[PDB]
Amino acid sequence: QYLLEAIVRDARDGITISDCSRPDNPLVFVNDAFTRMTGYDAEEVIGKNCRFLQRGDINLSAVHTIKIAMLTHEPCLVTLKNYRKDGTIFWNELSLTPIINKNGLITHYLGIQKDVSAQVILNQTLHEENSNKEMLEYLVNIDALTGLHNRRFLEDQLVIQWKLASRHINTITIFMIDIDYFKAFNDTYGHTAGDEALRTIAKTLNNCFMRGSDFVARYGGEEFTILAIGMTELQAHEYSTKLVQKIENLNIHHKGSPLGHLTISLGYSQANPQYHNDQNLVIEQADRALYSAKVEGKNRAVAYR
Amino acid sequence: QYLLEAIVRDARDGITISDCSRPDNPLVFVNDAFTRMTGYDAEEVIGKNCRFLQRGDINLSAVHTIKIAMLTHEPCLVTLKNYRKDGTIFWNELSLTPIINKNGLITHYLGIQKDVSAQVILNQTLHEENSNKEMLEYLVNIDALTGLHNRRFLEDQLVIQWKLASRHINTITIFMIDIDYFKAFNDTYGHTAGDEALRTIAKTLNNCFMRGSDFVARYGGEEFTILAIGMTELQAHEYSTKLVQKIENLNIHHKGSPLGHLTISLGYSQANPQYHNDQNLVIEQADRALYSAKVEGKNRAVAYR
Ligand SMILES: Cc1cc2nc3c(=O)[nH]c(=O)nc-3n(C[C@H](O)[C@H](O)[C@H](O)COP(=O)(O)O)c2cc1C
Ligand SMILES: Cc1cc2nc3c(=O)[nH]c(=O)nc-3n(C[C@H](O)[C@H](O)[C@H](O)COP(=O)(O)O)c2cc1C
Ligand SMILES: [Mg+2]
Ligand SMILES: [Mg+2]
C-alpha cells in the first residue's frame, strides 16, 4: 500500500522532513498537523531551520542533545518547550531519526512533533494532592512523586519490547540508576528535600532519550530504570556516562557525599533478545553492575561485561 | 523517500491496518506503538477485530459511529475508553480512514490510536478549581467550563485550515450550534444546572467527528462551533442532522422548552476556500443559517444555501 504514506501524512502529530545536504538542516517538508500544532504555514517555514519554535526559556541540555545527535548521525527523543506563531506555549516531544536509503547515510532527517502539554501539566500536578476514578486508572502506571512511569510499566514494557526486539533483531539495554548517599541527604537536609531532589533527578533523566520506544521509570524509592532499544555498545556507554554527568552538573549540594554534590551510580547491561530470550536476566546483570559501580567510582557507569 | 514509510511506522501512536475484503475487518498489520500502548503483541491480534480493547463501559454512540462509517466507507474520528491486556485503562482517540488505490475503493482501513488519557483527565479537572504558570499557558486555548477549545483556537485554526484546504482543494464547513431556550433552563432549573447541561452537551459534541482535523469549540456562553474539512454536501447534512438528534436523545428534561427536552439549533455553511478565499464569510453565513434554524424547526439543522 503506497497511499498509506499519504494517509499517515494526514496525522495528528507533526511530520517534518529536513534536508541534510544543505547547511543548518532546512525544513523541506511540512504536513498539515505541523501547521495546525504550531500555526506556521508551509510557505513560511520551508527552507528554514525549525529553531523558530524555541525561545530563551528552552532547555539548553535538550537542544544540545539535538545538536550532538544530528552531528553524530544518531536519533534522539527530547521534550521541548515550543512557542506557536500566535505566542501560545505547547510542550513538544520531538523524535528525530535519520533516513538511510541503500547506505545513503543521513540524506534527510525525520522530525515527529507530539503535543504532550497535557501530560506535562498533569504529571506535574500529580506530586501535589490536587478521588476521580479515571485519574486513579491513570495513576496505576504512574509514580505520584516523580511523575514518571512506575515499576509495573517497566516490567510490562520489558515483556512487550523484548518480543518486539527479538523480531527486528534489536538490542535491549537496561540502566539501573541509584542515588548515592541518599540516606545522608534525607537525614541531614530532610526527607522533603530528598523528595525534591528525587523530582529534580527524575525530571533530568526523563529527557534526551535516543529513540521513541525508550523511557525512564522509578524502580524504587531511590532507584530509577531506563529501557532502550536498538543501541550499540558505544552508544550505551556514552548515554550512561552522560547521564551520570548530567546529574553531576545539576550540582545539588550534598553534605554527606564526599564529592560535595549528590551523584548517580549506574549499572547497565545490553543483550540481544533474539539469542537467549531470557527475561529478568538483563535486570539481574544490571543490578550486579550497579553494585560494582558503587565501589568502582560512586559517580560512574559500569557495564556488566 | 520510501524508507520514510518504515521510519514513520516506528511512531508513538498506534498504527493498524485491517483488511476489508475479509468479514469483520480483521487486523492485518500492527506497528510497535500499538503493542506498547495496548500490551497486545502482533501474533495475538493479527486476523482479529480490534474490539478486544472495548468493554461494557464503552460509549455506545462512538462505536455506532465507527460501524456506520465503515459501512458507508467514510472516515471517522472517535474517542474511546479502551482496556489494555493487563487490565489498565487508556483513552484512545481513534482515527479511521479508508484506503483507495486507483479507485480500488476501501481495500483496507487505517486505524491510528493516540493515547489521550492525560488530556481527558486534565480537561475534566479544568471545570473544577483544582496558579501554575504552565497550566495557565494551557488554559489560553481551552474553555474552563466545558473543557473544549476556546474561540481563539477556532479563529486561528480557521486561518490555518483555510490555507490548507485551499492547497488540497478541500471543503471547509462551519457548524454554528446554539442551545434552545437556554435562559429558560437557567431560570427554572438553575444556573449551575445550566453549566452541567453545557458540559453534557459539550461532551456529546466533542466526539464522533469525521476526520482528524475536525474539532468543536465553545464560541459563546451557550454557543458552540464545529470546523470540518473535506466533507461533501450530503455528509455535512447528515452530520449536522445527527448532532441535533444526539442532543435530543440526551433527553435532558427542559420544562421551558415546548418539546420537553433541551434541543440544539444548528446552522452550517460549506464553502470551497480555493475559489473565493474570503474568511469570516462562512461564519457569517453559518450564523444567518442558525437564525433561520431557530424559527424553521427549533430542533433542526439548516444549511445556508
Ligand atoms: C526535522 C527537524 C525538525 C525539528 N523540529 C523541531 C521542533 O519542532 N521543535 C524544536 O524545538 N526543535 C526542532 N528541531 C531542532 C532545531 O531545528 C535545531 O536543529 C536544534 O534546536 C539545534 O540547533 P541549534 O542548537 O543551533 O539551535 C528540529 C530539527 C529537525 C532536523
Ligand atoms: C483498523 C481498525 C482499528 C481499530 N482500532 C480500534 C481501537 O483501537 N479501539 C477501539 O475501541 N476500536 C477499534 N476499532 C473498531 C473495532 O474494531 C470495531 O470495528 C468497532 O468497535 C465496531 O464494531 P462493533 O460495533 O461490531 O463492535 C478499529 C477498527 C479498525 C477497522
Ligand atoms: Mg542509594
Ligand atoms: Mg440560545
From TrEMBL, chains A, B:
Signal peptide: none annotated. Mg(2+) binds at D178, I179, E222. The keyword Nucleotide-binding applies. Keywords: Flavoprotein, FMN, Metal-binding, Nucleotide-binding. Coiled coil: none annotated. FMN binds at N49, C50, R51, Q54, N82, N92, Q113. The keyword Nucleotide-binding applies. This is Sensor domain-containing diguanylate cyclase.
